Design a protein around this ligand. Structure first.
Ligand SMILES: CCN1CCN(Cc2ccc(NC(=O)c3cccc(-c4ccc5nc(NC(=O)C6CC6)sc5n4)c3)cc2C(F)(F)F)CC1
Length: 258
């Protein structure tokens, strides 16, 4: 019971946000002042240790582009409280309305910010294991942050031999690049998990998404190298994206969709 622990009182659980197997996500007010997301755990559905492992994880990881843990209610009902992100998941946001007006530059910025949060995660020798647009939260100002709550996003060695490493996160990140540039569409359209596993192993990689720049597709392809160690770092990725429109696609012109 630590200095992240708080009273449920400082927490106003205003709006529910998600329905899970082990709890619900609420949008609430912390100290009646600061807007916060609140991941509840339904006691009797999952041990506190288990549910608060993610919280313990979030503690050691303070970064501008990661969902910041804000406080915790360990003693049941077990609330985890975090900075709130107005726009919800990057997935709901890509598929959704404001998605339609997102082009490469905003998409690549997001990529960049995630790449960054993920780079932070990298420095920390942490792994995400579920890096995918559904786990990126968008904030105001297209702030996106890595959050957490799927073999299409999962690097083979991770999907197959459970070799989940930041590198397999890079892989996912590659998938997230397609989410980002397909406006949230499901990776490997028309293919189902087994067709994907079968495929990705035979060496299949998604083609260049409609109107996405080959250089962004190459980035993706790097992210999906069979050999995990060949996959780039998120320091490379971040930087590659941050600088994308100068070092990589200076001649970029907005398009219909990207
Ligand atoms: C070993 C596998 N590894 C280890 C390390 N590894 C890092 C990690 C682990 C866990 C988490 N846990 C969360 O992130 C979290 C939890 C609860 C709530 C929220 C949360 C935050 C804001 C927010 N805004 C919202 N608005 C909307 O919905 C509106 C439009 C409709 S709903 C919402 N929910 C976020 C974050 C991170 C990580 F960040 F990656 F480092 C993940 C798993």
């Amino acid at each position: 019971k630590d200095a992240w622990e708080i009273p449920r009182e400082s927490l106003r659980l205003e709006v529910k946000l998600g329905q899970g197997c082990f709890g619900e996500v609420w949008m609430g007010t912390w100290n009646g002042t600061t807007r916060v997301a609140i991941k509840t755990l339904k006691p009797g559905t999952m041990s506190p240790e288990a549910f608060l492992q993610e919280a313990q994880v979030m503690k050691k990881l303070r970064h501008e582009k990661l969902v910041q843990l804000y406080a915790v209610v360990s003693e049941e009902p077990i609330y985890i409280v975090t900075e709130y992100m107005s726009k919800g998941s990057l997935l709901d946001f890509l598929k959704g309305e404001m998605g339609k007006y997102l082009r490469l530059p905003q998409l690549v910025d997001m990529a960049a910010q995630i790449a960054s949060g993920m780079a932070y995660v990298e420095r920390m020798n942490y792994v995400h294991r579920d890096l995918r647009a559904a786990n990126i939260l968008v904030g105001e100002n297209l702030v996106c942050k890595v959050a957490d709550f799927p073999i299409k996003w999962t690097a083979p060695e991770a999907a197959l031999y459970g070799r989940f490493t930041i590198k397999s996160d890079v892989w996912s990140f590659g998938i997230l690049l397609t989410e980002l540039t397909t406006k949230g569409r499901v990776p490997y359209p028309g293919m189902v998990n087994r067709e994907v596993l079968d495929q990705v192993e035979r060496g299949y990689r998604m083609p260049c998404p409609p109107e996405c720049p080959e250089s962004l597709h190459d980035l993706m392809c790097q992210c999906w190298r069979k050999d995990p160690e060949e996959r780039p770092t998120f320091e490379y990725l971040q930087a590659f994206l941050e600088d994308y429109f100068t070092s990589t696609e200076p001649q970029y012109q907005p398009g219909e969709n990207l």
